[PDB]
């Protein structure tokens with residue numbers, strides 16, 4: 442039976458986590474929400490299950506409800522330990538949802554403690570004295586202070602998490618972690634005795650992540666980004682529970698759908714345009730006026746024999762202007778809906794390869810495509826695997842978290858997903 446059950450707050454994050462688990466020796470299946478029985482095939486044969494939710498920015502009560510339903514489903518499949526997966530940049534607001542979901546999951550597991558560790562050195566995220574760094578910049582000087590939905594203006598994760606948590610948030614500091622697994626486990630026992638119910642965990646290296654994983658072998662719930670999962674397969678191997686343990690190219694029409702406003706995604710769009718590749722920009726203000734923007738994007742894609750880029754990707758100043766006119770949630774949802782409609786339309790027209798930039802964007806698109814589950818293929822860039830659906834004629838998807846990938850990612854992804 443499956444050993445590890447994971448709940449991810451966005452669809453790109455689900456693939457990121459599953460990639461890390463597969464690469465470290467756990468057969469993993471990603472489900473899009475909860476599958477009907479037995480709509481997903483060789484699922485009781487997985488070592489790990491990753492449930493993808495679109496719950497990062499919905500109301501906290503709904504995020505909790507969806508997360509509790511996923512937890513029960515995972516328990517019923519036989520899972521022994523659980524991971525709550527959120528963004529390595531801690532994407533949230535004072536209203537949630539990292540705090541409300543983690544605390545709800547702890548209560549439902551009857552556990553009095555977990556860690557919260559979004560560190561991801563491979564993608565430049567480290568944590569020191571509870572403060573999150575992106576490269577050598579604090580979170581709030583990294584570009585995340587300009588995220589369209591969850592601007593992060595405070596790098597102190599203890600303070601940030603405490604604001605969205607009812608119970609005591611503490612710190613598992615780098616100097617304990619540096620001393621190895623036994624010392625870390627001892628410090629966790631001390632934090633619990635101190636009344637800490639959730640601790641931000643420092644991690645300045647992949648070595649620290651493996652130390653944390655081993656120290657937390659005995660916790661029902663672990664929370665963080667994909668990095669905190671690095672060492673979990675080794676725990677099960679050591680315990681004698683898991684033995685020591687691809688995907689085909691899919692040819693056909695492709696498309697790139699970009700709803701992230703990140704610097705990385707801006708750079709990826711600019712590169713596409715630099716190379717003279719066909720692209721159409723989505724104006725949120727046209728969507729709000731009810732102009733036929735999705736139809737135009739479909740027509741644009743249909744007239745091209747090569748993949749096109751449909752993008753709303755814009756500068757922070759441009760996003761701010763749109764939001765002042767329409768509202769943050771309304772603008773964000775119009776764009777998501779548009780890209781999702783374009784994806785559904787393209788699916789009907791035979792498109793088989795989809796590269797999607799943005800977490801929420803991927804949630805919208807993949808739900809509109811009707812995907813029930815994904816098989817995890819090879820890593821394209823840190824945090825971003827190629828994936829395929831389980832249909833007789835599969836779809837190939839690359840769901841790129843907004844901050845991930847190099848400048849050339851769109852082309853790299855299209856090529857790894859398959860041929861023309």
Ligand SMILES: Nc1ncnc2c1ncn2[C@@H]1O[C@H](COP(=O)(O)OP(=O)(O)O)[C@@H](O)[C@H]1O
Nearest residue numbers: 589701753755772773776777799800801802843
């Ligand atoms: N030009 C724009 N104006 C307003 N909102 C936008 C614009 N472009 C993108 N957005 C919205 O910003 C949000 C980006 O979130 P997401 O897709 O999760 O990206 P990321 O992975 O970078 O966090 C989406 O709701 C998207 O629709």
